[PDB]
Every structure is written in C-alpha cells, then in structure tokens.
Design a protein around this nucleic acid. Sequence first.
RNA 1: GGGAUCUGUCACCCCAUUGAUCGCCAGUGGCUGAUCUGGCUGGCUAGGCGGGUCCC
Length: 17
Amino acid sequence: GISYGRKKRKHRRRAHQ
RNA sequence: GGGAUCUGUCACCCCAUUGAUCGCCAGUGGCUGAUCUGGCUGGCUAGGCGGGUCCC
C-alpha cells in the first residue's frame, strides 16, 4: 500500500554530540 | 595510547500544516523546491572525527 503525504518538518535540532 | 568532561561539524526518527513564508506560468488551477517556530526537562546508559584540559 502506497502513501502520499509528509509533515515536511525539520529533523535536525541537536547539531551536536 | 586509553578513559572522563566540554566545544565545533556531520547523519536520522516522532508530534503540531488541519499553523506561516518565498519563486514561476494562466481567472478558479498546477508545482517539495526552499525557508520558520515550539518540545533537548524525547534519544549520545544510539554513531564518527578533530582540539584543549585532567588522570594513568
């Protein structure tokens, strides 16, 4: 089953160890 | 050479587009391409590399 639709939201907030 | 702490950089996941902004072509239309905020009191007792300091 295919699915179309994304939240299109950022996934990077840490940007650090 | 190892371990611990700190910093920088890089790669992802979840919730809120049903919230917000930009560009192009035509009147209703079409297009992820890019950007924004909040939760790090969600995950480093998930990963890699460099530098400084301490200890051996």
